Write a protein that binds this ligand. Structure first.
Ligand SMILES: CC1=C(/C=C/C(C)=C/C=C/C(C)=C/CO)C(C)(C)CCC1
Length: 174
């Protein structure tokens, strides 16, 4: 049971165009502090020069109770690893958070599911101190019993097992 971040294995030869399109977040594992809550849908596209970007809608509560529908946007720069990106994000609205997080795709089938992960804070022993993860599906209705078994194994080998929470979509942002 090695939970060092550098130990985690990511998607072999990640194909940036097979991955583009609409993805629906079905479950998540939260990080410390302020973060997207529900009704979150992401849209990936890749330009002619291979650059990948994405926009995202989601409900987020602020200060104290203030649900707003955050329109986020991120760009991705490539690393020595096809699956491991650096993502710069920001919102159409200014008060919304800007920032830079790693963006790694641990696993995907590009036809039905994608499993994302990001460690914002590394510990002294290499394991992650503060992290979040997303489980996306191409189908707004969710994964098959059989794709769910793959997903739950991924969560365990990430040491995030039993820490995910089902995301719901009730047109709060449509
Ligand atoms: C770029 C965007 C993503 C992440 C957004 C997050 C990090 C937003 C947080 C917003 C907050 C907390 C705003 C507070 O005012 C993910 C990874 C889903 C995939 C594609 C595009």
């Amino acid at each position: 049971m090695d939970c060092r971040v550098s130990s985690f294995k990511v998607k072999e030869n990640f194909d940036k165009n097979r991955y583009s399109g609409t993805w629906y977040a079905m479950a998540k594992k939260d990080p410390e502090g302020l973060f997207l809550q529900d009704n979150v849908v992401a849209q990936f596209t890749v330009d002619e020069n291979g650059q990948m970007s994405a926009t995202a809608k989601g409900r987020v509560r602020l200060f104290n109770n203030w649900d707003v529908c955050a329109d986020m946007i991120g760009s991705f720069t490539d690393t020595e690893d096809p699956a491991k990106f650096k993502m710069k994000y920001w919102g159409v609205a200014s008060f919304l958070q800007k920032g830079n997080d790693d963006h790694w795709v641990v696993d995907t089938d590009y036809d039905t599911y994608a499993l994302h992960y990001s460690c914002r804070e590394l510990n002294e022993d290499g394991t992650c101190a503060d992290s979040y993860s997303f489980v996306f599906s191409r189908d707004p209705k969710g994964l098959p019993p059989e794709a769910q078994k793959i997903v739950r194994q991924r969560q365990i080998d990430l040491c995030l097992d039993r820490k995910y929470r089902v995301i719901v979509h009730n047109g709060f942002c449509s």
